[PDB]
């Protein structure tokens, strides 16, 4: 007679049924999955089938109204750690799964929860009324675990591994409010979810592992622990990612950006190399040719060097041109080392070596102003320091290096240079908008400045930051594979990031933007004491990502 | 009996099954394809479905490296002439097919071939390794024909003619290189492919002859 305070790893507890669990469902499922041949990996005494293994944990507080959604999960073999490994050698799967819930409360609390299975074809989100489905009610004072089973309600005969199809969804909601009769600061409890395959889960058709690999099915391995710790760079400045920058207003980034369709709207490959263009007018203001600023420009839509697009040459920064003249260093400009070369043979001009500032302008021989849309604009170079002589050749070419630094007037630092007001964008790209409490984020990096090249992180003169939209391994991996059959429009792919003290969640949309649920805060996330990164899977987009650092 | 050097039109030869011909596949294929109505053109005495008829031919050279594909077909009613004639007057099909191979070589050559059936979801491309699938190896000195059966493995109940969906693929490639010990000018042989419908093949919906479809006709006309 064991007590209920100790639970065994094979123990389901109380089995809570629902009207969707029927015998004819199981018989039809087995008899129609039989077209894939005999079932595989169905030995009932194996250790990977008999035990429950960890899936998730969530929080239930007293401020949650009835009908609030606390936890959702889509039907997949990626919810178990061992059926995700075994799916690399098979081409189909069919069957159900069991989910075990443990509520960590006491006998003094009040309140109840509700769980139901949602058939495919129904949108999951706020306004989904769970209590008018066939449901099970679970008390907050329960000591033994409660397990319900999600069956396979599908319109196919089996699920192909790349393209499963329509699946059911398990949703847990709030029946009645949580009550603490004492009242005070202690108002929250925690529930843990675990998973185990059911008795009719199987695979069917064996295949070579050197077929469609694990990097073409789900983008779970695109974001790992060393990517955000010490290996990955950003897609704008090619610098070490140190933090996360919330943007509560919104932004749109076009160049060197990839969606979940294997497509780009920009004009750059996913690599950092030289910027080369020819056939552009070069000039210099004034008459004296010693210590004279150098000017160069060319129109947009003419650079025939890229197989991708001809808006700008490969590697051009997507920043609007800040206008300047005279002996004044501009504020927050993309500057980089380079020189102007001779278009007839390729011989560079040796005396015209300086740091040139790049951007997008509207009138280059006339008055100078920044511009954002690429239609009717042009690409403009102008050196920030004094250079010797100037070539007035009409087809003259420009050669700049890959990486750049910030142009600052003084030795002190400023805010993140790439603010969302001035980002040059091709017309036709979508923007990133806040969805509820979730707001778009960028990836911060320590980038040197032209007023103090010795300055690093933690310096006494301030730290200079430059931001990008995606990490570089992510956009490299997004241009090699296709993930159309991994995320519906209106969903996020969620990763859990743990720290030494707290943990937070980030999500990736179909458009290729990253999100975090922080509201209207503008504080940088430190991202120094990060420990582990774990994938979670598809979740509804109108659900708050958990953000607590403590 | 015939002494191996002459073959009848209804004679398959040896039978080679890899791993995908099962009883539950046929039982699930017959029972589920009844959503289209009663089956049509199902009579196991007719001349069009008891004999093997000509489909294709291909050549095997000495200079063919191992792993190079010599013959590939998707699962379709276009692989037999009489089912291709009958498919213009039906709008749905299900079932499998048989492929007979006759190697026109001599007993002095060397070399092997390999055949496999690929599941529907796998992309047929450069990174496909067919020797890490369940396969069967055929010698170049074989005298009798060898028959390989491809079954119908599908996620849908039947195959519409304008939209079949996902189908398996039969791939035949080089196992080991062709060797002629005398050398010289003779450096290639020929293999002939015949076809015959399987016992569980059927059509369903009668439709109109030369009806238009949502897919596209072959670019031969």
């Amino acid at each position: 007679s064991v007590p209920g305070t100790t639970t065994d790893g094979m123990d389901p507890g109380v089995v809570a049924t629902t009207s969707v669990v029927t015998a004819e469902n199981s018989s039809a499922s087995i008899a129609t999955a039989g077209i894939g041949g005999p079932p595989q990996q169905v030995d009932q005494q194996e250790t990977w089938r008999t035990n429950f293994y960890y899936n998730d944990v969530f929080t239930w507080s007293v401020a949650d109204a009835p009908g609030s959604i606390l936890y959702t999960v889509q039907h997949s073999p990626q919810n178990n750690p061992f059926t995700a490994v075994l799916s690399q050698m098979y081409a189909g799967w069919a069957g159900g799964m069991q989910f075990r819930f443990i509520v960590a409360g006491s006998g003094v609390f009040g309140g109840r929860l509700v769980a139901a299975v949602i058939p495919p074809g129904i949108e999951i989100g706020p306004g989904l009324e769970v209590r008018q489905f066939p449901h099970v009610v679970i008390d907050a004072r329960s000591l033994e675990p409660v397990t319900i089973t999600m069956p396979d309600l599908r319109p196919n005969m089996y699920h192909p591994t790349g393209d499963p199809g329509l699946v059911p969804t398990l949703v847990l909601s709030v029946y009645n409010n949580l009550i603490n009769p004492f009242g005070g600061s202690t108002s929250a409890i925690q529930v843990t979810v675990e998973t185990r395959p059911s008795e009719d889960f199987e695979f069917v058709m064996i295949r070579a592992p050197s077929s469609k690999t694990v990097d073409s099915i789900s983008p779970a391995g695109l974001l790992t622990t060393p990517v955000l710790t010490g290996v990955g760079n950003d897609n704008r400045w090619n610098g070490q990612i140190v933090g996360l920058q919330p943007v509560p207003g919104g932004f749109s980034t076009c160049n060197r950006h990839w969606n979940l369709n294997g497509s780009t709207y920009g004009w750059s490959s996913p690599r950092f190399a030289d910027i080369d263009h020819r056939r552009g007018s070069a000039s210099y203001p004034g008459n004296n040719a010693t210590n004279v600023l150098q000017f160069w420009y060319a129109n947009a839509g003419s650079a025939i060097d890229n197989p991708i697009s001809q808006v700008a040459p490969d590697g051009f920064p997507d920043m609007s041109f800040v206008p300047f003249n005279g002996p004044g260093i501009p504020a927050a400009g993309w500057v980089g080392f380079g020189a102007i070369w001779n278009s007839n043979s390729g011989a560079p001009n040796v005396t015209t070596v300086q740091a040139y500032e790049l951007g997008f302008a509207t009138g280059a021989p006339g008055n100078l102003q920044p511009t954002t849309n690429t239609s009717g604009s042009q690409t403009v170079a102008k050196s920030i320091y004094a250079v010797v002589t100037g070539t007035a050749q009409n087809p003259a070419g420009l050669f700049v290096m890959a990486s750049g630094v910030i142009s600052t007037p003084s030795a002190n630092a400023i805010t993140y240079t790439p603010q969302p007001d001035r980002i040059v964008t091709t017309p036709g790209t979508p923007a990133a908008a806040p969805v509820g409490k979730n707001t778009p984020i960028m990836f911060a990096s320590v980038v040197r400045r032209t007023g103090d090249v010795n300055a690093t992180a933690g310096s006494a003169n301030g730290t200079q930051y430059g931001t990008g939209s995606q990490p570089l391994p992510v956009t490299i991996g997004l241009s090699l594979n296709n993930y159309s059959s991994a995320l519906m429009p209106g969903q996020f792919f969620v990763w859990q990031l743990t720290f030494a003290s707290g943990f937070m969640e980030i999500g990736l949309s179909v458009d290729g933007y990253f999100y975090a649920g922080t509201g209207a805060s503008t504080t940088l996330i430190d991202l120094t004491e990060l420990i582990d990164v774990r994938p979670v899977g598809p979740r509804p987009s109108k659900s708050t990502l958990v953000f607590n650092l403590g | 009996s015939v002494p191996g050097t002459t073959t009848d039109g209804m004679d398959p030869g040896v039978v080679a099954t890899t791993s995908v011909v099962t009883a539950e596949n046929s039982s699930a294929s017959v029972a589920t394809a009844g959503i289209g109505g009663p089956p049509q053109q199902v009579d196991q005495q007719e001349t069009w479905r008891t004999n093997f008829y000509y489909n294709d031919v291909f050549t095997w050279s000495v200079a063919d490296a191992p792993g190079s594909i010599l013959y590939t077909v998707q699962h379709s009613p276009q692989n037999n002439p009489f089912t291709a004639v009958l498919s213009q007057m039906y709008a749905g099909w299900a079932g499998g097919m048989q492929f007979r191979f006759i190697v026109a070589g001599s007993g002095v050559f060397g070399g092997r071939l390999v055949a496999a059936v690929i599941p529907p979801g796998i992309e047929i491309g450069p990174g496909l390794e067919v020797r890490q699938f369940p396969h069967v190896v055929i010698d170049a000195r074989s005298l009798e024909p060898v028959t390989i059966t491809m079954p119908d493995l599908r996620p849908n109940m039947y195959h519409p003619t304008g939209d079949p969906g996902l189908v398996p693929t039969l791939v035949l490639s080089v196992y080991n290189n062709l060797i002629n010990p005398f050398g010289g000018s003779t450096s290639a042989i020929q293999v002939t492919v015949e076809t015959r419908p399987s016992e569980d093949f059927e059509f369903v919906m009668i439709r109109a002859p030369s009806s238009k479809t949502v897919d596209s006709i072959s670019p031969a006309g």
Partner: peptide
């Protein structure tokens, strides 16, 4: 599995 084919036969 047997009940499915049994019902369709019956």
């Amino acid at each position: 599995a047997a009940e499915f084919f049994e019902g369709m036969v019956h």
